Amino acid sequence: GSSGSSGRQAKGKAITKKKYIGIRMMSLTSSKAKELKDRHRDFPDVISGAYIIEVIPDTPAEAGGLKENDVIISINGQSVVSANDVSDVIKRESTLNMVVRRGNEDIMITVIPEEIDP
C-alpha cells in the first residue's frame, strides 16, 4: 500500500560521487512512531531514527541485515535521529556499523555501500 506522491530528487549536478545500498526510508515523526508501535506490536521500544519501508534486493543492505520495518538508533558508534543522517554515513564512511533493535535486543548490521557516480 503506497503512502502517496513523492517525486523528489531531480536531475541536478554534483562533483563527487554517492554511495548506494538499495533502501527506502521515510522521515520518522513523533506522531508516526507513536502510531507505528500501537499499530505494529513488532515495532521496538523506539520512536526516533530511520524507518525502513523496503530494502531493494541484490543490495549490500539486504544481505547485511537491514530488513523492512526497522529503526536505526546508531551508526558507526554515532546515534542518529533522522533517515537523512543514516544516509550520510554511507558516503562518509566506507563501512556501515548500524545498530537496529530486533525482538528485544540490539543487533549490529555491517553493510558495505558501493560508491556510485552522481
Curated annotation (Swiss-Prot):
Q: Where in the cell is it found?
A: Cell membrane; Secreted; Cytoplasm, Cytosol
Q: In which tissues is it expressed?
A: Widely expressed, with strongest expression in placenta (at protein level). Secreted by synovial fibroblasts. Up-regulated in osteoarthritis and rheumatoid arthritis synovial fluids and cartilage as compared with non-arthritic (at protein level).
Domain (PDZ) spans 8-105
Q: Which disease is it linked to?
A: Macular degeneration, age-related, 7: A form of age-related macular degeneration, a multifactorial eye disease and the most common cause of irreversible vision loss in the developed world. In most patients, the disease is manifest as ophthalmoscopically visible yellowish accumulations of protein and lipid that lie beneath the retinal pigment epithelium and within an elastin-containing structure known as Bruch membrane.
- Explain the purpose of this protein: Serine protease with a variety of targets, including extracellular matrix proteins such as fibronectin. HTRA1-generated fibronectin fragments further induce synovial cells to up-regulate MMP1 and MMP3 production. May also degrade proteoglycans, such as aggrecan, decorin and fibromodulin. Through cleavage of proteoglycans, may release soluble FGF-glycosaminoglycan complexes that promote the range and intensity of FGF signals in the extracellular space. Regulates the availability of insulin-like growth factors (IGFs) by cleaving IGF-binding proteins.
Its family remark reads: Belongs to the peptidase S1C family.
Its assembly, as annotated, is: Forms homotrimers. In the presence of substrate, may form higher-order multimers in a PDZ-independent manner. Interacts with TGF-beta family members, including BMP4, TGFB1, TGFB2, activin A and GDF5.
- What does the entry's domain section say? The IGFBP N-terminal domain mediates interaction with TSC2 substrate.
Protein's name in the database: Serine protease HTRA1
Q: Which organism is it from?
A: Homo sapiens (Human)
The range of the complete sequence contained here reads: 370 to 480 of 480
